[PDB]
Amino acid sequence: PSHSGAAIFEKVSGIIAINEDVSPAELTWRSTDGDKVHTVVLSTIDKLQATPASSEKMMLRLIGKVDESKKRKDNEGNEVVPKPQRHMFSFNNRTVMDNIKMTLQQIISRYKDAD
């Protein structure tokens, strides 16, 4: 009744499960008919947002990391962190999402406090 849930990506449905057995508590996604599996390491993930009250669209969004240290200037003497790789997960379950986001989200704030 937690961690494991259903989610969809790129029009491909699958099951989303979190793993708190390994060092970097990560989660992997596996499709049922799409014959695909996406392992998203919460470690590499720094951001996590679910859709509550205001957002009844039931969807979980997790972003990787950001390192501006490797940025690059420009003709306008301006720079910025290299556009990372964000991920927006969306399922047709508002109850599930809020159940898996609450467990996967906390880990971010918990990890970020040490990582």
């Binding site: 969809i8 720094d46 951001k47 996590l48 947002q49 679910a50 859709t51 509550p52 205001s54 957002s55 009844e56 669209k57 969807m59 979980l60 969004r61 950001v66 927006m88 969306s90 989200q105 971010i108 704030s109 970020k112 406090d113």
Partner: peptide, 27 residues
């Protein structure tokens, strides 16, 4: 596009609920 979703109604409301824990440094 027009009669689609997951990118106009069912995918545009999670940009205002999180982003406030211990990321991007701070304390």
């Amino acid at each position: 596009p027009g009669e689609e979703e997951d990118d106009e109604r069912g995918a545009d409301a999670t940009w205002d609920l999180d982003l406030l824990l211990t990321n991007f440094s701070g304390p």
